[PDB]
Design a protein around this ligand. Structure first.
Ligand SMILES: C=CC1=C(C)[C@@H](Cc2[nH]c(/C=C3N=C(/C=C4\NC(=O)[C@H](C)[C@H]4CC)C(C)=C\3CCC(=O)O)c(CCC(=O)O)c2C)NC1=O
Ligand SMILES: C=CC1=C(C)[C@@H](Cc2[nH]c(/C=C3N=C(/C=C4\NC(=O)[C@H](C)[C@H]4CC)C(C)=C\3CCC(=O)O)c(CCC(=O)O)c2C)NC1=O
Ligand SMILES: C=CC1=C(C)[C@@H](Cc2[nH]c(/C=C3N=C(/C=C4\NC(=O)[C@H](C)[C@H]4CC)C(C)=C\3CCC(=O)O)c(CCC(=O)O)c2C)NC1=O
Ligand SMILES: C=CC1=C(C)[C@@H](Cc2[nH]c(/C=C3N=C(/C=C4\NC(=O)[C@H](C)[C@H]4CC)C(C)=C\3CCC(=O)O)c(CCC(=O)O)c2C)NC1=O
Ligand SMILES: C=CC1=C(C)[C@@H](Cc2[nH]c(/C=C3N=C(/C=C4\NC(=O)[C@H](C)[C@H]4CC)C(C)=C\3CCC(=O)O)c(CCC(=O)O)c2C)NC1=O
Ligand SMILES: C=CC1=C(C)[C@@H](Cc2[nH]c(/C=C3N=C(/C=C4\NC(=O)[C@H](C)[C@H]4CC)C(C)=C\3CCC(=O)O)c(CCC(=O)O)c2C)NC1=O
Ligand SMILES: C=CC1=C(C)[C@@H](Cc2[nH]c(/C=C3N=C(/C=C4\NC(=O)[C@H](C)[C@H]4CC)C(C)=C\3CCC(=O)O)c(CCC(=O)O)c2C)NC1=O
Ligand SMILES: C=CC1=C(C)[C@@H](Cc2[nH]c(/C=C3N=C(/C=C4\NC(=O)[C@H](C)[C@H]4CC)C(C)=C\3CCC(=O)O)c(CCC(=O)O)c2C)NC1=O
Ligand SMILES: C=CC1=C(C)[C@@H](Cc2[nH]c(/C=C3N=C(/C=C4\NC(=O)[C@H](C)[C@H]4CC)C(C)=C\3CCC(=O)O)c(CCC(=O)O)c2C)NC1=O
Ligand SMILES: C=CC1=C(C)[C@@H](Cc2[nH]c(/C=C3N=C(/C=C4\NC(=O)[C@H](C)[C@H]4CC)C(C)=C\3CCC(=O)O)c(CCC(=O)O)c2C)NC1=O
Ligand SMILES: CCC1=C(C)/C(=C/C2=NC(=C\c3[nH]c(/C=C4\NC(=O)[C@H](C)[C@H]4CC)c(C)c3CCC(=O)O)/C(CCC(=O)O)=C2C)NC1=O
Ligand SMILES: CCC1=C(C)/C(=C/C2=NC(=C\c3[nH]c(/C=C4\NC(=O)[C@H](C)[C@H]4CC)c(C)c3CCC(=O)O)/C(CCC(=O)O)=C2C)NC1=O
Lengths: 160, 46, 161, 49, 407, 164, 177, 177, 177
């Protein structure tokens, strides 16, 4: 979160928190009412955000679901959508934490080692998160879509 | 909530510190061979 | 850190005697299998990622250590596994070439089971991963070479237990 | 460059060795001496150390 | 109906072994039938004679030098005019069965020896013995055994063709009838001269009393304690030699048990038992994260099925098919083998292994605290500051006696 | 474990004799025959995941009705257990070639199998369609040697004779 | 062993009483719903060969380490042995429901099952899970709320015999723990 | 009971494995000296009637209170049993040398021998010396260094079977201690 | 046993040949009569299998209520434990005879024996009879005045070793009284 790494920043520097750090912990907690509303929208829209998320993913990447693709059959396609439910969950954590620190140490650190070791095309799962982003930002206003989309594209950046 | 929790800090942590006691590499507490036996009180002739 | 030749020289040196017929008798036995070990270490270097991918999918891929709460849930924790399994398949390759498991306890076994208990890593699932990794290694290098590479896997599993 | 010391990040993240141990092993590594030891002189290597 | 009929009903027409004896511990070890053939070689007559001397004397040293009254009862059998039932009746009427198991035996020790020797089982209930007590005291011992082997029990489960054996019959009509069975037929070593203690009470190993244990278990309903049914035990002799993950064989009792080791072990087996009851309510639905999308990912994946081998050409390459039952679901060799690796990797099974491993370490550590006053202790632990107090002044538990002098 | 040792030390122990020349001669047969039957224990071990894959789908190609609802192979988990069981029967045949007799089959797979396959409503004819496909997929000098194909098949149709 | 009539006889023989009219109001009510007890225990016995396979395999889906090599329900001997005591316990509970008295359960089925299952290495917490699935089924078949089979019954209440067969299953849970 | 072939089966069942190429080199080396093992059992069972009188009478000249009255080799029936368990132990050790694993030693000979010898009142420390003279004889016969009878052999090393038969007598001498 | 006389350490790498800082003067002085003491313990432990069986049967045939049912030596577990404890006591006098002092006996064998035998109901008046036979047995064997058995010692004297070992047996016999 912004609270924990604004601390560990000033922790390492042998000092307390500046006004630049304490006027933002202050500014973040007054932002906390609006963050829970945004995460509350994505919380009980996972049925559509995931299922329509895998909608565009297969239309854009039919190789991964075609015979020979990693997510082929009734089995892998279920797990094919399971990971999108994971990453959609971590974005709800990042929105409430005000940072990608929850998304950092979960689903991002060493993610290329996992998916390379699973045979999954890491570029394909990046395409899946982008398809979820258009569904997510379509569910919110412009002021919110600059945030909810904002955490997806960070996940897109670290996932390639 | 899973029973075999783990160690570490930050996100992805189960609320238990690293190493179960915040020590990664624990200094040992045992004595050597002959005075682990000396404390036992049974290996006296040995 | 001794190979079969280093261990033979040490025991023959530690008594201050020359290399008699019994010491050279084992050394000739090691040189006979010298051709087998390199080809065994050859294919294992080639299929390092494939062997580890086969072991985890065959032993602990879908068990509930893989699911939330299990010991392998987060991506950092999953990525630590294949990093961790790489050492077992790598150091076992060194023991297979050196013909002596001294390198394992020198560089792998000591402080290992005492470390997994600290982190809370399940030793039970770890050994079965190495056992499954031993099973696929016998596929590649053959039977007798698998017997050689397999002889150091369970050495890790025994001491890690 | 995608370099990796997985063994050293192992033994330091667990606390099995210090940062000073992790720093010394980095210095005696071969990716170091290929970088800051081979292309230079022992004179210049001392200052870069 | 998994078992159609017991062993006490005879095997009907269509089996060589009864249905309970197939999947019991009958098939593993040496407690089988060695039924005599029609005409046989005198070596094969010696095989059926050596199993009779093992069974009806109970590993006793029969001292082949004498075989004094034996060789008349042998020669009636080697002709063929004596049945194996009539041989094992005639051995139970001799003097060398009387001077072992009757001249020094209590009438509880004698009845429990005739159940092991003549039949297979142990005595089940109390009034089963009380028939055979009152039949001996009014008719005598020669009319006891004649009224003991000619009931409905022996002629069905052995007939007149086979020798007796220990009847691992699967269905036990009290559950303690398996417990007293394995406590009587005490392993492959112990004989009944040893088990009744007839040698140690003997004046130079001769004419000693055959006293009995387990007399308190036939009067009251009380089970056998588990150490007599797991250590000196025929289940160790007909052992499957499995990999049993709770190992049923008990550890030998340790010297120098401490109360500090037990008092954390009892808290550990309460810790796992309270954590097992939480984790078993969440099993098989909420522990499977891929289960929630199985309703959609196997209807998303039901598009463009391929009937022969070859298609999904994908722009003109091969990329074919497997078309089996497994790989149409996308599964691999690491997908059915994931059930065999479910001891470390499981969570509910990870508790129940260490529950029964540490309770089995508890039940031999707590039972090693039956030795109190002169026992030399030790301190194998590093004498840490953790110590439970000796606060046992007033009532803390007090099991509810609402009738204190109710009269 | 019914083997060549545990018949000559089970019959001698019931007789109370030392291992005579009749029982040392029986383990001389455990040196000549075991040169071949361990070769069929080694080829089956190194290729086990492709044999059961080639055999377990012949259970469902012959009997396609198992994927109907209410039947035995109706969902994902019950299909994976059906491939698991043919891996079990192919594992005990690997255990029986390395023991020397039918020891691991008569104790671990066969005994009690007619009571669990009737109670759980599994068709036992579907099991022998998978094992008899494996007996007829066996090319004798290609899979293994000529003699090792005799040893591997003679435990296979013994297992067929047990289930039928 | 006893039944529901002969339970109050040894209760009345402890004070050497005759069986008078104040005692017999329970027993005259016992034969008043004696049609219901045979109508109850028919529903368990007609589904008993699928009640065990619903329960022992329902223990498996909760604790899947038992079918792994090592777990005590792995080998075809062990599964046929665990199914065998699945229906020994179901036989004696249906005996105890029929007699209406728990004496035949506790001297013939449960007397020493605890020390037996310690000696074989059978895990005692998993056998409670086999019993409690059979506890939830016998109270479902008696009240006819089984979610894939309804049987024909006369209209009326039955939850007394559902409670009685529930108390005969927790005696199995208390005996082996 | 097990042998050296089926000990590595139930070890390979503990890891749910096939007996692959790693473990068969342990067993093909076991049948490589399979002619050596049968040449080692034949040295035991050819002198086995003489080794049991050599070993029980060596116990008597060390601890002569057994043949003292009130002892445990005084009565002549009680002497003839002590010659019997000298050779039943030698029957089960020779099965363990034949099978290559000490399961039949630790499920049939030592299965209750410790509580046998307590309950017969047999001195246990003299049962160690009855066993351990047969350890020092069998390692003299298998190495063919018995000081009054040499058997004919094809020459070569045999010291692994010597320590194998010394390992089976120590599992007897520890289980009855 | 092996702490009862001191060894000298002559080789290097020991830290007792050089930085020993002592020689054990109390036990160098006991090899000044060491062969005569070692013959005396050899006179006991070569008859220790027979001395315990004669003494335990000695108090049986003088007080016959112990093998009566209800007595403390009727059952087989108690009769095996009574023959075990006399054997343990005869070993611990033979430590104290060998080491030359009773300090091994009073803490490993006698510390907490009178509280044990009243916690088990062991007759203390009969157990002191059982050691006075072994007091009288051991002075016959050390002085070589046993009636049925002699041993070929050297020519000399062994009183004041017989009265040394007779001073240990009443030291046992008053520690349980
Ligand atoms: C350890 C036991 C073991 C075996 C028994 C074989 C069994 C076997 N053979 C084949 C595969 C094959 N088997 C054969 C051989 C033949 N085909 C025939 O119809 C003739 C009867 C016979 C000629 C000798 C051929 C030609 C193939 C490849 C094509 C095919 O599947 O038929 C396959 C499918 C996987 C593969 O391609 O290898 C399997 C499991 N392999 C093993 O590992
Ligand atoms: C020791 C050796 C050994 C075996 C031989 C098997 C035998 C076996 N199979 C099953 C269990 C099963 N076996 C099958 C198998 C089949 N049903 C089908 O659709 C096909 C006809 C067939 C496979 C080709 C199924 C579906 C189950 C699960 C039954 C159920 O859940 O109702 C069970 C019950 C426990 C379980 O695994 O869930 C057992 C003991 N297991 C073993 O451990
Ligand atoms: C008269 C009353 C009566 C009973 C109540 C039952 C109970 C019972 N079960 C077994 C015997 C057994 N019982 C089990 C049972 C189980 N293992 C598990 O993991 C599950 C928790 C559980 C089944 C649900 C197993 C696996 C064996 C066999 C052990 C073996 O063969 O060594 C035995 C020993 C018999 C034998 O093995 O020969 C008895 C007495 N049988 C009876 O006769
Ligand atoms: C892991 C695998 C798995 C199973 C096998 C079942 C096992 C199972 N069944 C029931 C619950 C039940 N189980 C049955 C049993 C049966 N139904 C019938 O009609 C037949 C007679 C018999 C199957 C042959 C019945 C009758 C109920 C009561 C509810 C009902 O089904 O109508 C319960 C308790 C409540 C519940 O959790 O549903 C469990 C654990 N559940 C599982 O999660
Ligand atoms: C030989 C075998 C044999 C039987 C099977 C029973 C058959 C049976 N059941 C009932 C009759 C009945 N049975 C029930 C029981 C039930 N109804 C429900 O709603 C519940 C689901 C279930 C309770 C567990 C009820 C409520 C009646 C009607 C009241 C009664 O007659 O007791 C009756 C009396 C009315 C009639 O003649 O139909 C009879 C004969 N009796 C027998 O002699
Ligand atoms: C299958 C396992 C198996 C064995 C290992 C043996 C050993 C053995 N010996 C005896 C029985 C005996 N065993 C001994 C033996 C000895 N006493 C000594 O002082 C010596 C140290 C030792 C001889 C070497 C004696 C003296 C008896 C006689 C007891 C008696 O007759 O009362 C018994 C009791 C039999 C009986 O008397 O009914 C057994 C089980 N027999 C077996 O069946
Ligand atoms: C006081 C009485 C007394 C004895 C009778 C002997 C008995 C005896 N012999 C040996 C030692 C041995 N004992 C034998 C036995 C025999 N030799 C053979 O050739 C025959 C097969 C068999 C006699 C029939 C053998 C073979 C050895 C090994 C060395 C050898 O003699 O070649 C040992 C073990 C080593 C030792 O402790 O010294 C003992 C106690 N020693 C004694 O102190
Ligand atoms: C049916 C009965 C039966 C037997 C008795 C053995 C008989 C036997 N022993 C050996 C053969 C041998 N036996 C030995 C053993 C020894 N040599 C020594 O110097 C030691 C004293 C002793 C070790 C214990 C050695 C070293 C060989 C030769 C190497 C070998 O063949 O293994 C051989 C192979 C050579 C030959 O043709 O003779 C045979 C058949 N095998 C059987 O099938
Ligand atoms: C190191 C020193 C040392 C000892 C001296 C003994 C002392 C001793 N004896 C017994 C235990 C016993 N001791 C006896 C012995 C006797 N009772 C009699 O009536 C006879 C007079 C006498 C035999 C000579 C008996 C019979 C028991 C068992 C008590 C019982 O089971 O009722 C116990 C209890 C634990 C056990 O069972 O062993 C102890 C500590 N043990 C030791 O560790
Ligand atoms: C009522 C039954 C009854 C017995 C069982 C015996 C037992 C017995 N023996 C001795 C007394 C003795 N007991 C022995 C013991 C032995 N002598 C030997 O040669 C053997 C090696 C060893 C027995 C195995 C010795 C050496 C003496 C001393 C007397 C003597 O010189 O023999 C004493 C003590 C006498 C005294 O204190 O003065 C008793 C009670 N006597 C009895 O009255
Ligand atoms: C919270 C962060 C996080 C992630 C992301 C994660 C992923 C993860 N993905 C897996 C499998 C898988 N993942 C896929 C995924 C895909 N196939 C495709 O074609 C697509 C490109 C892609 C999805 C959009 C497939 C097919 C498998 C099964 C692979 C196999 O069975 O071999 C598995 C192994 C099975 C399991 O335990 O679920 C893990 C652990 N774990 C985590 O903790
Ligand atoms: C060369 C000898 C050697 C070994 C073996 C070694 C192991 C080692 N394993 C570690 C962690 C780990 N190891 C695992 C492994 C597993 N999880 C499971 O469920 C499986 C059973 C298992 C894979 C087989 C996991 C998940 C972690 C991360 C733990 C955490 O973040 O708390 C760590 C902590 C630091 C790090 O990974 O950076 C070390 C030091 N170090 C060494 O020097």
């Amino acid at each position: 979160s912004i609270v924990t790494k604004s601390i560990v920043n000033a922790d390492a520097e042998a000092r307390y928190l500046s006004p630049g750090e304490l006027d933002r912990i202050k500014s973040f907690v007054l932002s906390g009412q609006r963050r829970l509303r945004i995460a509350q929208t994505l919380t009980e829209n996972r049925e559509r955000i995931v299922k329509q998320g895998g909608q565009q993913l297969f239309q854009r990447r039919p190789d991964v679901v075609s015979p020979g693709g990693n997510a082929y059959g009734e089995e892998m396609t279920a797990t094919c959508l399971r990971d999108l439910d994971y990453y959609l969950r971590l974005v709800t954590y990042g929105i409430i934490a005000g940072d990608v620190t929850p998304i950092e140490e979960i689903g991002l650190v060493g993610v290329k080692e996992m998916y390379s070791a699973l045979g999954t095309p890491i570029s394909g799962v990046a395409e899946g998160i982008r398809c979820m982003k258009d569904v997510a930002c379509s569910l919110l206003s412009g002021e919110d879509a600059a945030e909810v989309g904002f955490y997806f594209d960070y996940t897109l950046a670290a996932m390639q | 909530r899973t029973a075999y929790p783990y160690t570490g800090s930050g996100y992805g942590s189960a609320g238990v510190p690293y190493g179960q006691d915040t020590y990664g590499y624990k200094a040992t507490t045992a004595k050597s061979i002959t005075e682990t036996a000396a404390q036992a009180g049974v290996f006296n002739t040995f | 850190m001794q190979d079969a030749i280093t261990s033979v020289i040490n025991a023959a040196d530690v008594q201050g005697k020359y290399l008699d017929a019994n010491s050279v008798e084992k050394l000739r036995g090691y040189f006979q299998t010298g051709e087998l070990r390199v080809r065994a270490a050859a294919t294992i270097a080639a299929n390092a990622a494939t062997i580890i991918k086969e072991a985890v999918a065959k032993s602990l891929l879908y068990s509930d250590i893989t699911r939330p709460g299990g010991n392998m849930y987060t991506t950092r924790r999953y990525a630590a596994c294949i990093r961790d399994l790489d050492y077992y398949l790598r150091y076992a390759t060194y023991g297979m070439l050196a013909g002596d498991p001294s390198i394992l306890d020198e560089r792998v076994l000591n402080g290992l089971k005492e470390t997994y208990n600290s982190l809370g890593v399940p030793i039970g699932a770890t050994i079965q991963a190495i056992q499954a990794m031993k099973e696929v290694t016998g596929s590649l290098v053959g039977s007798d070479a698998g017997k050689e590479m397999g002889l150091y896997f369970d050495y890790i599993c025994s001491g890690l237990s | 460059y995608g370099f990796s010391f997985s063994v050293l990040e192992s033994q330091v993240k667990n606390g099995q060795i210090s940062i000073k141990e992790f720093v010394r092993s980095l210095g005696k590594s071969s990716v170091y001496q290929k970088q800051f030891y081979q292309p230079y002189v022992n004179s210049r290597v001392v200052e870069l150390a | 109906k998994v078992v159609d009929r017991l062993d006490s009903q005879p095997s009907a027409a269509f089996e060589q072994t009864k249905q309970v004896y197939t999947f019991s511990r009958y098939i593993l070890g040496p407690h089988r039938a060695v039924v005599a053939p029609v005409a046989m070689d005198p070596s094969e007559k010696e095989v059926v004679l050596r199993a009779v001397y093992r069974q009806v004397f109970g590993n006793a040293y029969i001292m082949e030098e004498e075989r004094a009254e034996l060789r008349v009862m042998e020669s009636q059998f080697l002709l063929g005019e004596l049945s194996v039932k009539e041989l094992v009746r005639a051995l139970a009427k001799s003097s060398t069965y009387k001077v072992r198991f009757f001249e020094g035996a209590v009438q509880y020790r004698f009845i429990e020896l005739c159940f092991k020797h003549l039949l297979g089982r142990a005595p089940d209930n109390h009034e089963e013995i009380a028939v055979h007590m009152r039949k001996y005291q009014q008719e005598g011992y020669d009319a006891e055994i004649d009224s003991y082997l000619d009931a409905g029990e022996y002629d069905n489960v052995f007939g007149d063709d086979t020798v007796p054996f220990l009847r691992f019959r699967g269905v036990y009509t009290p559950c303690d009838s398996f417990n007293r069975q394995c406590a009587l037929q005490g392993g492959w070593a112990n004989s009944d001269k040893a088990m009744g203690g007839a040698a140690l009470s003997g004046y130079n190993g001769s004419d000693g009393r055959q006293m009995s244990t387990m007399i308190g278990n036939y009067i009251s309903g009380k089970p056998i304690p588990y150490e007599k049914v797991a250590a000196d035990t025929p289940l160790k002799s007909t052992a499957p030699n499995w990999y049993a993950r709770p190992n049923p064989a008990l550890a030998p009792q340790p010297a120098y048990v401490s109360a500090k080791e037990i008092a954390e072990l009892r808290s550990r087996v309460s810790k796992l038992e309270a954590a097992w009851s939480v984790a078993v309510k969440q099993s098989a639905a909420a522990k499977d994260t891929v289960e929630t999308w199985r309703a959609a990912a196997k209807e998303m994946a039901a598009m463009r099925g391929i009937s022969p081998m070859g298609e999904a050409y994908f722009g003109g390459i091969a990329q074919k098919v497997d078309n089996g039952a497994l790989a149409q679901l996308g599964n691999k060799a690491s997908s059915y083998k994931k059930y065999l690796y479910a001891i470390e990797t499981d969570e509910v099974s990870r508790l129940e292994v260490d529950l029964e491993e540490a309770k089995g370490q508890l039940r031999v550590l707590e039972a090693a605290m039956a030795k109190s006053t002169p026992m030399t202790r030790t301190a194998e632990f590093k004498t840490l500051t953790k110590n439970v107090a000796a606060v046992t002044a007033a009532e803390k538990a007090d099991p509810l006696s609402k009738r204190p002098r109710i009269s | 474990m019914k083997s060549v040792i545990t018949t000559v030390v089970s019959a001698a122990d019931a007789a109370g004799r030392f291992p005579s020349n009749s029982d040392l001669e029986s383990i001389q047969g455990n040196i000549q025959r075991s040169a071949a039957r361990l070769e069929a224990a080694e080829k089956l071990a190194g290729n086990h995941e492709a044999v059961v894959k080639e055999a377990g789908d012949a259970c469902f190609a012959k009997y396609a009705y198992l994927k109907n609802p209410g039947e035995a192979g109706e969902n994902q988990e019950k299909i994976n257990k059906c491939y698991r069981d043919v891996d079990h029967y192919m594992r005990l045949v690997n255990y029986c070639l390395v023991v020397g007799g039918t020891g691991p089959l008569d104790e671990w797979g066969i005994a009690g199998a007619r009571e669990v396959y009737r109670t759980l409503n599994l068709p036992t004819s579907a099991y022998v369609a998978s094992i008899a496909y494996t007996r007829d997929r066996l090319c004798v000098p290609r899979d293994m040697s000529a003699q090792a194909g005799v040893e591997f098949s003679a435990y296979l149709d013994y297992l067929i004779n047990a289930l039928s | 062993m006893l039944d529901a009539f002969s339970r109050v006889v040894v209760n009345s023989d402890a004070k050497a009483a005759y069986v008078g009219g104040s005692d017999l109001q329970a027993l005259k009510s016992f034969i008043a719903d004696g049609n219901k007890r045979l109508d109850a225990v028919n529903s368990i016995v007609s589904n008993a060969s699928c009640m065990v396979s619903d329960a022992v395999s329902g223990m498996i889906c909760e604790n899947p380490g038992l079918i792994s090599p090592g777990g005590n329900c792995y080998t075809n001997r062990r599964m046929a042995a665990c199914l065998r005591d699945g229906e020994i316990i179901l036989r004696y509970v249906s005996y105890a429901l029929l007699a209406g008295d728990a004496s035949v359960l506790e001297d013939r089925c449960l007397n020493g099952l605890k020390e037996t299952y310690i000696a074989l290495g059978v895990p005692t917490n998993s056998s409670i899970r086999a019993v409690s699935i059979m506890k939830a089924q016998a109270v479902a078949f008696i009240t006819n709320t089984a979610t894939e089979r309804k049987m024909s019954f006369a209209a009326g209440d039955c939850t007394s015999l559902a409670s009685e067969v529930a108390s005969y299953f927790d005696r199995v849970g208390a005996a082996i723990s």
